[PDB]
Structures are given as structure tokens and as C-alpha cells.
Amino acid sequence: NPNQELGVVQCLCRRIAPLTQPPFGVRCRATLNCPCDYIGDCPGPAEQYMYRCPNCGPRSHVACSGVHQGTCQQVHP
Ligand SMILES: [Zn+2]
Ligand SMILES: [Zn+2]
Ligand SMILES: [Zn+2]
């Protein structure tokens, strides 16, 4: 069988870790801060990373490109 390449990622401890599956989209759970009282969920895009850190062992964390802080136009158009 041919080898299956998996990407690498920086663990939260900052070491380089091998992903065990490709990044996959997820719900972003961050809370928003706009100068008004608006309440709402971040629409993303957010992704979750599964990896096996040589230091930390199995670990995961989520990253999101949505706007969490800023003006009312930036957070909630
Ligand atoms: Zn680590
Ligand atoms: Zn987000
Ligand atoms: Zn606002």
C-alpha cells in the first residue's frame, strides 16, 4: 500500500506535532465583544486539530478565523 501523508501542527506547548487526521470544521464557541450589547455565536470558520505531541501525547485544540472582537460592523454585519 502507498503511504498516507499527514500534516504537522504546532502544539499548544509550541512543539511540532503530527496530525492524526486532517483538520475538520467545528462550531466556534468563543464569545463576542462588540461595543454594544449584541449576543451571538461566531459563524466561523473554525477548525479542530487532532495530533499526538511527542511531549504532551494525544492533544487537540480549535482555531477560528472569524472576528471575535472589534466594531459592531466587524463582529456582526
Ligand atoms: Zn505539546
Ligand atoms: Zn470564531
Ligand atoms: Zn455590536
Tell me the three cell numbers of residue 63.
Answer: 482555531
* Resolution in units of Å: 2.5
Classify residue 11 as exposed, middle or buried by CB count within 10 Å of its CB (0-12, 13-18, 19+): buried
Helix (H) / strand (E) element for 50: namely strand 46-53
CA of 51 to the centre of ligand 2 (A): 21
Q: Break the chain down into helix, strand, coil percent, rounded to 5.
A: 5, 35, 60
CA of 45 to the centre of ligand 3 (A): 20
Q: What technique solved it?
A: X-ray
The distance in angstroms from the start CA to the end CA of the chain is 49
Measured from the Cβ of residue 17, the count of other Cβ atoms closer than 10 Å reads 23
CA of 30 to the centre of ligand 3 (A): 15
Domain-wise residue ranges, the chain: 1-77
Tell me the three cell numbers of residue 25.
Answer: 470544521
